Amino acid sequence: VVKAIARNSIGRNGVGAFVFPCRKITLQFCNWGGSSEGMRKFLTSKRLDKWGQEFPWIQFEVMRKSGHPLLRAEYTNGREKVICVRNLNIDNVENKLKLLKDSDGDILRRRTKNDNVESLNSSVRGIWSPLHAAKRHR
Amino acid sequence: GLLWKIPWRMSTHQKTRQRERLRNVDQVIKQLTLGLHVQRCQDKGLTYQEAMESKKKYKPRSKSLRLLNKPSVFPKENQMSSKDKYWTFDKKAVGYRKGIHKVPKWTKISIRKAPKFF
Amino acid sequence: VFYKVTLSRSLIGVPHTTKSIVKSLGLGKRGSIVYKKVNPAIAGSLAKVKELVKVEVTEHELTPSQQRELRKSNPGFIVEKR
Amino acid sequence: TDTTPLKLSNELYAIFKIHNRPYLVTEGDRVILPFKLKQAEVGDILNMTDVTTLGSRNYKLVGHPINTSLYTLKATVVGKTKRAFQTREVTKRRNRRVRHAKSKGDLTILRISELSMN
Amino acid sequence: SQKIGHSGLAFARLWHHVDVARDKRTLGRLASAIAITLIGRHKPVYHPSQDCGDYVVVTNCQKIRVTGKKFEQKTYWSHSGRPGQLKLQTMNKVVADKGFGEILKKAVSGMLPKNKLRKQRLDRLKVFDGSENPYKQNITAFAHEQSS
RNA sequence: UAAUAUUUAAAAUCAAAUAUAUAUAUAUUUGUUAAUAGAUAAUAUACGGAUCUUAAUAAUAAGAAUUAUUUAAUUCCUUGGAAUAUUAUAUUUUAAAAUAUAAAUACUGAAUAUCUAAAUAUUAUUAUUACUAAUAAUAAUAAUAUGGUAAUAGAACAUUUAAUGAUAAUAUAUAUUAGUUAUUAAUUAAUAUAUGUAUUAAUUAAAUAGAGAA
RNA sequence: AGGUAAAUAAUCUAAAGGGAAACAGCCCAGAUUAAGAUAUAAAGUUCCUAAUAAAUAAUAAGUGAAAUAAAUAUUAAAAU
RNA sequence: AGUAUGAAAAUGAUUAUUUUAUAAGCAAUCAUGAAUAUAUUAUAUUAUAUUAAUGAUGUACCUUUUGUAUAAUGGGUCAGC
Ligand SMILES: [Mg+2]
Ligand SMILES: [Mg+2]
Ligand SMILES: [Mg+2]
Ligand SMILES: [Mg+2]
Ligand SMILES: [Mg+2]
Ligand SMILES: [Mg+2]
Ligand SMILES: [Mg+2]
Ligand SMILES: [Mg+2]
Ligand SMILES: [Mg+2]
Ligand SMILES: [Mg+2]
Ligand SMILES: [Mg+2]
Ligand SMILES: [Mg+2]
Ligand SMILES: [Mg+2]
Ligand SMILES: [Mg+2]
Ligand SMILES: [Mg+2]
Ligand SMILES: [Mg+2]
Ligand SMILES: [Mg+2]
Ligand SMILES: [Mg+2]
Ligand SMILES: [Mg+2]
């Protein structure tokens, strides 16, 4: 007899199509507040428009709130990076935005030495066996 | 007193390293001489390849280089004796000899010609 | 003709005269490579620090940029933007 | 070079080298390069023009950049994110000042989309 | 990728057998060889944070080869905490007392990494002065080898 | 060739090698003993330890882990080539023989150098953005530099007070936890407690302005 | 004398890293931050412990194997 | 020595998770299994957090010194000054 034990498929973002990881970016600023001056300038300066033109798969919200200025960004996986751009200037804000866009939403994490690849595919060659070795031990 | 654990002999590996270093020094000198010769050739009126080919290669004029070239003053590694690759003349040792590896910065310092009979 | 002179041993631990000589030679750091025109003076200078330096004669010199280019590793990929 | 038994297999691995760093992958894997790419942006695709070794369970083609004619191995760039932030604390042994040495290196993430024989 | 799969066979402890009658390595060398096996350095799945070494059965340990005058002159030592209780026993004496197996074991112990795992690894090694032993059945044996 | 009395030498002599005219001569360079005893004290053997010196009969198999002289298979000619040998593999032929291929770049080894990115400063080239634009901000390319006590110089942050000052219980302040930004700081989300709400953002002015060291 | 007084050079002082078992001053090498592919330094390559294979001799004492103990005696070996 | 408030720490008891009765040294860092907890994108062959299997590395801090793991100085811990 053969019985099936249930399972589900794992998504590999880039193998078929590629969904773009960043989805929404919210430029948050304040009219009053010297910390939010750079942000304001950025908003003014057609740079935002240019960015929009470049990257239409990602939407730019523009909120008005009383605190420090922010760039909260929302990703496919669900997670949300948030960068407070306190007291930055236009270029720095732009750089921050770029950084946000580039990243996948995934959490930061310490890598060990040489941990490069991350597969969910069973080894093409088998896992070594002492009995199926080409050279026996002694 | 304070333990400076440094042996009176050298390990084979150390000896090999020393030999290699010696060879390298010789090579540098050789290269210098070659360069000088080719410069001379070029001055005279030849190409690089031609200069390289030339039978009559020019000796160097500068004193130091000339001295280095002389095997009496500055031996090459194949010429050099075992007793001079791994020992120096110490004026105050037993046997008037001392392992080179004891000499302060022996890895940089060059020192080939020990005295004639010592 | 040019000398390609490399500083193969650190100046740390070497007498100050020799350090000075090396500095004059235009050799800043260990592993640093200089291309010097071949004239007797230069040769003489090199002779003095021979135990610190690796030399080889070459046809032509190279500007630092060229050297850098030569050094650069092969990025095993060709980008395509879409 | 008779490349039929690689053609016929279903499972296949490759050992491509980016800047001489070898990464061994199958299709669907995520390669975490320990540096920031400037050539490629997010969503771009890289055709690997240096692949040291293609291999099935029992056979393996090898060579210093083996012909791009033989295979198609292409990776898409997914992410440019940094690895987590750390403050390793630097100090000597009777000196009150400390030098906080911060570290947040950058990563490029690829996904091996295609890995096939041509 | 490569590490993924059924890894049960890799980390299986094989029993190896060494007949010291039919092995021409002298004591120390043999011990060294055994040490590697015990540690599990022979297998590519070894990682230092893991005891993954095999079992070694040594048999006919009475015919081990020792060079020079070491049988007479090589002295094994043991000290309690108590001053004046230094025991110094010559190899031959030790053999007479316990056996050649003990000798071999000591060497192996010396060879091995000095940490928690050590003792386990040491105990993995089973030694017998003569031929007979209780592990005859469990030594690794292939089906194609059955011509004899 | 036995016995015989010294010496432990490449100075001389001989041999070999390199450089000068060159099958010779000249000049330089290198090549000449080993064991044992003598030997030795007090917590415990004391190469760091295990231990290391090899052997037919037999191992697809060990043969110093010491001392001396070397090499990176061995030999020749001038990095190279050739031959020889060895090992491994493949194919054919009758466990052998033939053919072809590969290996001979020993390896480890640092926070050294390079590569690979990131930061800062300077020098020299750029590109974008904005009306000392010969500027500033950001980004490139090449280069050089970035251990540090005493010490000098430059730049920031926290806290509190004064000047100016929107805003709001969906707000704020403080706290805990998990995130985020190259992170003594701030910010995001959830949670708990206040409070009809900032001496709040920012620029100045100042300081009872930062504590594991009495 | 791990003494003392000066001379020259280096290092330590104020210098982390590798080696010297452990190590201020020795041998290499100067840490802006990572990364770990390629050269490597001094040192090493049976195991502990990262990495090794050869050649020719000598040694039989465990001499020796990273800290060489003298006169002298004995035994052998070469050269005249 | 005002009145409210007080999840500030040191300190005590207790419960939970986890590790621990063949193991030896600034009690951390790095590697690395396993167990548990949480997570309204764990799609999982998931992610974080906690935790002394196991391995490697690792002479507290200050002061004063030519030089300190020193068996030299100083400190019982925390809060305020
Ligand atoms: Mg010492
Ligand atoms: Mg000090
Ligand atoms: Mg400190
Ligand atoms: Mg003793
Ligand atoms: Mg030793
Ligand atoms: Mg560096
Ligand atoms: Mg500095
Ligand atoms: Mg104060
Ligand atoms: Mg306090
Ligand atoms: Mg403090
Ligand atoms: Mg003194
Ligand atoms: Mg001082
Ligand atoms: Mg140091
Ligand atoms: Mg200095
Ligand atoms: Mg530096
Ligand atoms: Mg001994
Ligand atoms: Mg000794
Ligand atoms: Mg100390
Ligand atoms: Mg006290």
From Swiss-Prot, chain A:
The keyword Cell membrane does not apply. SUPFAM superfamilies: Thioredoxin-like (SSF52833). GO terms for molecular function: structural constituent of ribosome. Pfam families: L51_S25_CI-B8. Keywords: Mitochondrion, Ribonucleoprotein, Ribosomal protein. It comes from the Eukaryota. GO terms for biological process: cell redox homeostasis; mitochondrial genome maintenance; mitochondrial translation. GO terms for cellular component: mitochondrial inner membrane; mitochondrial large ribosomal subunit; mitochondrion. Component of the mitochondrial ribosome (mitoribosome), a dedicated translation machinery responsible for the synthesis of mitochondrial genome-encoded proteins, including at least some of the essential transmembrane subunits of the mitochondrial respiratory chain. The mitoribosomes are attached to the mitochondrial inner membrane and translation products are cotranslationally integrated into the membrane. Also has an extraribosomal function, being essential for mitochondrial genome integrity. May interact with MHR1 to take part in the mtDNA repair mechanism. PANTHER family: 39S RIBOSOMAL PROTEIN L43, LARGE RIBOSOMAL SUBUNIT PROTEIN ML43. Present with 3400 molecules/cell in log phase SD medium. This is Large ribosomal subunit protein mL43. It comes from Saccharomyces cerevisiae (strain ATCC 204508 / S288c).
UniProtKB/Swiss-Prot annotation, chain B:
It is found in: Mitochondrion. Pfam families: L31. Keywords: Mitochondrion, Ribonucleoprotein, Ribosomal protein, Transit peptide. GO terms for biological process: mitochondrial translation. GO terms for molecular function: structural constituent of ribosome. GO terms for cellular component: mitochondrial inner membrane; mitochondrial large ribosomal subunit; mitochondrion. InterPro entries: Ribosomal_mL60 (IPR016340). Present with 2100 molecules/cell in log phase SD medium. Belongs to the mitochondrion-specific ribosomal protein mL60 family. Component of the mitochondrial ribosome (mitoribosome), a dedicated translation machinery responsible for the synthesis of mitochondrial genome-encoded proteins, including at least some of the essential transmembrane subunits of the mitochondrial respiratory chain. The mitoribosomes are attached to the mitochondrial inner membrane and translation products are cotranslationally integrated into the membrane. Component of the mitochondrial large ribosomal subunit (mt-LSU). Mature yeast 74S mitochondrial ribosomes consist of a small (37S) and a large (54S) subunit. The 37S small subunit contains a 15S ribosomal RNA (15S mt-rRNA) and 34 different proteins. The 54S large subunit contains a 21S rRNA (21S mt-rRNA) and 46 different proteins. This is Large ribosomal subunit protein mL60. It comes from Saccharomyces cerevisiae (strain ATCC 204508 / S288c).
Curated annotation (Swiss-Prot), chain C:
Pfam families: Ribosomal_L30. The keyword Calcium does not apply. One of its GO terms (molecular function) is structural constituent of ribosome. Keywords: Mitochondrion, Ribonucleoprotein, Ribosomal protein. GO terms for biological process: mitochondrial translation. Residues 66-82 are annotated as: Disordered. Its main location: mitochondrion. Disulfide bonds: none annotated. Component of the mitochondrial large ribosomal subunit (mt-LSU). Mature yeast 74S mitochondrial ribosomes consist of a small (37S) and a large (54S) subunit. The 37S small subunit contains a 15S ribosomal RNA (15S mt-rRNA) and 34 different proteins. The 54S large subunit contains a 21S rRNA (21S mt-rRNA) and 46 different proteins. Component of the mitochondrial ribosome (mitoribosome), a dedicated translation machinery responsible for the synthesis of mitochondrial genome-encoded proteins, including at least some of the essential transmembrane subunits of the mitochondrial respiratory chain. The mitoribosomes are attached to the mitochondrial inner membrane and translation products are cotranslationally integrated into the membrane. PANTHER family: LARGE RIBOSOMAL SUBUNIT PROTEIN UL30M (PTHR15892:SF2), MITOCHONDRIAL RIBOSOMAL PROTEIN L30 (PTHR15892). Belongs to the universal ribosomal protein uL30 family. This is Large ribosomal subunit protein uL30m. It comes from Saccharomyces cerevisiae (strain ATCC 204508 / S288c).
Curated annotation (Swiss-Prot), chain E:
Its main location: mitochondrion. The modification N-acetylserine is found at S1. The keyword Heme does not apply. It is found in: Mitochondrion. It comes from the Eukaryota. Keywords: Acetylation, Mitochondrion, Ribonucleoprotein, Ribosomal protein. GO terms for molecular function: mRNA binding; structural constituent of ribosome. GO terms for biological process: mitochondrial translation; negative regulation of translation. GO terms for cellular component: mitochondrial inner membrane; mitochondrial large ribosomal subunit; mitochondrion; ribosome. Pfam families: Ribosomal_L13. Residues 1-3 form a propeptide. Gene3D superfamilies: Ribosomal protein L13 (3.90.1180.10). Component of the mitochondrial ribosome (mitoribosome), a dedicated translation machinery responsible for the synthesis of mitochondrial genome-encoded proteins, including at least some of the essential transmembrane subunits of the mitochondrial respiratory chain. The mitoribosomes are attached to the mitochondrial inner membrane and translation products are cotranslationally integrated into the membrane. Belongs to the universal ribosomal protein uL13 family. NCBIfam families: rplM_bact. Component of the mitochondrial large ribosomal subunit (mt-LSU). Mature yeast 74S mitochondrial ribosomes consist of a small (37S) and a large (54S) subunit. The 37S small subunit contains a 15S ribosomal RNA (15S mt-rRNA) and 34 different proteins. The 54S large subunit contains a 21S rRNA (21S mt-rRNA) and 46 different proteins. Present with 6700 molecules/cell in log phase SD medium. HAMAP family: Ribosomal_uL13 (MF_01366). The gene is MRPL23.
